[PDB]
């Protein structure tokens, strides 16, 4: 099965998932000087006031905080998007060292981690139908750097001991994802893909310019998670990021200049 190891990592994925070599794969390097300001881009509308978190799950590749997406409770609209996209889950990618961990890069700079807030287009009725469509998903990506603690992240950090291994889940209600956002909603956007198998080319990527800062203690707690299940040999869940893929015939657009 695919993973992030020496024998099953990103360079192997194309054997089971040939779209890994496709025309709109993610992540990419964001070259800030070649991105083009698009004044027709609208400000993002992030409406998370009614978000209903349900649970947190270690899926063996990352941990997902999952939300109730059976009604328009937490939605993303505006920006480059047409229609309404519902928040289904968020997760992170992170490194074994503070100098790596993000999937997107900015002028080849790697951040310590990257947050992905995953949303699906309500015109397709459910998430599984949405991932089959070229405009099915919108993922809001936010970079993490190590510095001051992020207070809004601490309740995530504190539950991780309960989902150490693959397949473990825990109740996780009343979490407010607005506490994970930076001050500015300036962004870059491009059409791309899921960054893990099945690597489907269904994502409008929206990557925020402004990182959030988390403390060294917070990221150390991510690095104590395990890829393995309980009772299997322990392998630390670190470096669960795919490297930058070729931009090919794509232009990255900026909402700011
Ligand atoms: N890192 S990311 O681009 O934000 C990303 C990467 C992979 C996923 N992902 C993996 C499996 N699935 C999935 C789950 C249920 C389903 F019906 C279809 C899927 F593709 C999925 O959405 C979701 C998000
Ligand atoms: Zn992700």
Swiss-Prot record:
Localization in the cell: Cytoplasm; Cell membrane
Catalytic activity: hydrogencarbonate + H(+) = CO2 + H2O; urea = cyanamide + H2O
Effect of residue 116 to E: Strongly reduced activity
Effect noted on mutating residue 103 to A/Q: Strongly reduced CO(2) hydrase activity
Keywords: Acetylation, Cell membrane, Cytoplasm, Disease variant, Lyase, Membrane, Metal-binding, Osteopetrosis, Phosphoprotein, Zinc
Documented effect of changing residue 59 to D: Strongly reduced activity
Enzyme class: lyase
pH dependence: Optimum pH is 6-8.
Residue positions where Phosphoserine is found in the record: 162, 169
Effect of residue 59 to T: Reduced activity
Mutation effect (residue 2 to A): Impaired activity, not rescued by 4-methylimidazole (4-MI)
Coiled coil, from the record: none
Alpha-carbonic anhydrase domain span: 1-256
Membrane spanning residue stretches: none
Assigned EC number: 4.2.1.1, 4.2.1.69
Molecular function GO labels: arylesterase activity; carbonate dehydratase activity; cyanamide hydratase activity; zinc ion binding
Active site feature: 61
UniProt disease link: Osteopetrosis, autosomal recessive 3: A rare genetic disease characterized by abnormally dense bone, due to defective resorption of immature bone. Osteopetrosis occurs in two forms: a severe autosomal recessive form occurring in utero, infancy, or childhood, and a benign autosomal dominant form occurring in adolescence or adulthood. Recessive osteopetrosis commonly manifests in early infancy with macrocephaly, feeding difficulties, evolving blindness and deafness, bone marrow failure, severe anemia, and hepatosplenomegaly.
Name of the protein described by the UniProt record: Carbonic anhydrase 2
Protein source organism: Homo sapiens (Human)
Lineage: Eukaryota, Metazoa, Chordata, Craniata, Vertebrata
Gene field: CA2
């Amino acid at each position: 099965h695919w993973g992030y190891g020496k024998h099953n990592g990103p360079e192997h994925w194309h054997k089971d998932f040939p779209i890994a070599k496709g025309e709109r794969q993610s992540p990419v390097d964001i070259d800030t000087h070649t991105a083009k300001y698009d004044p027709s881009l609208k400000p993002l509308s992030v409406s998370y006031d009614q978000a209903t978190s349900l649970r947190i799950l270690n899926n063996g590749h990352a941990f997902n905080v999952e939300f109730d997406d059976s009604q328009d409770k937490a939605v993303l609209k505006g920006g480059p998007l047409d229609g309404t996209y519902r928040l289904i889950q968020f997760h992170f990618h992170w490194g074994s060292l503070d100098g790596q961990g993000s999937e997107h890069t900015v002028d080849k700079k790697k951040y310590a981690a990257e947050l992905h807030l995953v949303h699906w287009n309500t015109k397709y009725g459910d998430f599984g139908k949405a991932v089959q469509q070229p405009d099915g998903l919108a993922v809001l990506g936010i970079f993490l750097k190590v510095g001051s603690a992020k207070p809004g992240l601490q309740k995530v950090v504190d539950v991780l001991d309960s989902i150490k291994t693959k397949g473990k889940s825990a109740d996780f209600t009343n979490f407010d994802p607005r506490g994970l956002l930076p001050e500015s909603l300036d962004y870059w956007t491009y059409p791309g893909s899921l960054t893990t198998p099945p690597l489907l080319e269904c994502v409008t990527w929206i990557v925020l310019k402004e990182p959030i800062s988390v403390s060294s203690e917070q990221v150390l707690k991510f690095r104590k998670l395990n890829f393995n299940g309980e009772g299997e040999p322990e392998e630390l869940m670190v470096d669960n990021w795919r490297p930058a893929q070729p931009l090919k015939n794509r232009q990255i657009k900026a909402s700011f200049k």
